[PDB]
Amino acid sequence: RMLSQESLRKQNRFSRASEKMFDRIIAAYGRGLAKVLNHPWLTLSVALS
């Protein structure tokens, strides 16, 4: 019922900082998984531990 697009249309400095944290954290998390997803042996070792 309340659907609108002004929230995406309206941008504040706090909101700007919020989604800029969002994309930089997406990028950091992304390189983290990109390096992690290739060798499950260390994960198996730490799971047994």
UniProtKB/Swiss-Prot annotation:
Q: Which organism is it from?
A: Escherichia coli (strain K12 / MC4100 / BW2952)
What range of the parent protein does this fragment cover?
A: 497 to 545 of 1040
Q: Which family does it belong to?
A: Belongs to the resistance-nodulation-cell division (RND) (TC 2.A.6) family. MdtB subfamily.
Task: State the oligomer form and interacting partners.
Answer: Part of a tripartite efflux system composed of MdtA, MdtB and MdtC. MdtB forms a heteromultimer with MdtC.
- Localisation per UniProt entry: Cell inner membrane
Give the protein's recorded name: Multidrug resistance protein MdtB
Q: Could you tell me what this protein does? A: The MdtABC tripartite complex confers resistance against novobiocin and deoxycholate.
Q: What is its induction behaviour? A: The mdtABC operon is transcriptionally activated by BaeR.
